[PDB]
Symmetry: none
């Protein structure tokens, strides 16, 4: 029972455009984290969310991720894109604020790394974990 | 000027109107105002030259129910936000009630301690961040 | 490590104690935690090297009633704050619910508009500020 | 009926130590602003406040002030001191956060300028003007 699905792209060639054509390949998550042996795969997280009532963030904790790409889709078009990751930066968290605009949204996160790829992620709002 | 003000007692003017009334705005003596409870709408107009460095318009508007912001360039609406106390607060790169603690630049190591307690479930997210992560990226 | 944790189920340990129990703290896998509602006290311990640039410990602790922070150096208490939701929020250089609007650095002039409305008395303070005024000075 | 008093030091030689010995020379304010012809006087504002219950700031708006000196006294000793003023800075406001520590405090502000010295000042908290 979760809005959190995952796609492993062992080839690392999928771009956001490609991944939008591939939604039935995202598989469900039993839990909001993952861990994989160090490799050149791209891992894609897809988060399907309803329209938001209150300020929220996507929180991801992903140590040693070298490239983290974040995309926000509505509705079938790309509204925000940010490109970050460890690439003199002492943080390993990422927050992305989520718009309150009466619309559903999809988030996509691409992660790549030369180390074991792991991450934990949650939706949080000002009272904490969305869902209480 | 160049921080200016216009009172709309009708509460019914919109951005389109207020760009055709550019000159009805009266210069402020100081960068604040207070008016007794009324259904009026107050409009603020700020004219700025080109900018060399990051900067923000900061507005502290306690009890303002509807706040609407618009950035204009060449007579064009470039950005707009809508917030106020009767609406969701603006997006922020971090939750506005997060706690922040300045770490000293002083050539010495440091250890930090934080005790937390609650009668609701105990939950915290935390990290060390720099200027950029505090501000967001533009 | 080096972001570490210790659970005090008694809720009764104090800073003096927790410096004599340095090694009971267990390394975190990730920089957050959640525990079901209990009267325990959770202590966080963060070991940092000397610092070259401004930086902050950021803690987002929604529903935490009592939060206590201490900065230690050479085994000495250098700073301490006490806040949490059941206490006054920490001092901030600006009110934490102020609204901030990024002004673009783009070689062009700009005008800004803000509509405000309330059913309580109408009051706003505002200005254009830079990185330093946003952060305070150390 | 106000906690806001003023001292003109036409000589500009008073230091914070001197001004603490001179409290009966601060005269009351009819309103929370002032304006003087451009001159080399120092103007000192003294704000007497009770222990605070909630987060508050001292707000001062003082365009073209060249030196603004802020001091917070408790109880007879100087706890905070900041030295600012227009001296590439596009603001003309100053906020100073006020500690909530169950103690009264006195604020002192010294202002100097080569232009007409004016200022408006208020105590504000998260609901607005302290006093509503």
């Amino acid at each position: 029972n979760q809005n959190w699905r995952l796609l492993r792209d062992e080839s690392a060639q999928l771009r956001i455009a490609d991944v939008l054509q591939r939604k039935e390949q995202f598989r469900p998550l039993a839990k909001r984290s993952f861990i994989f042996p160090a490799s050149p795969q791209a891992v894609w997280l897809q988060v399907q969310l309803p329209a938001q009532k209150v300020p929220s963030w996507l929180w991801i904790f992903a140590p040693r991720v070298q490239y983290l790409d974040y995309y926000l889709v509505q509705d079938g078009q790309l509204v925000r894109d940010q490109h970050t990751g460890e690439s003199p930066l002492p943080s390993r968290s990422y927050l992305f604020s989520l718009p309150v605009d009466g619309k559903p949204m999809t988030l996509y996160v691409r992660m790549t790394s030369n180390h074991p790829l792991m991450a934990w992620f949650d939706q949080i709002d000002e009272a904490g974990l969305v869902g209480l």
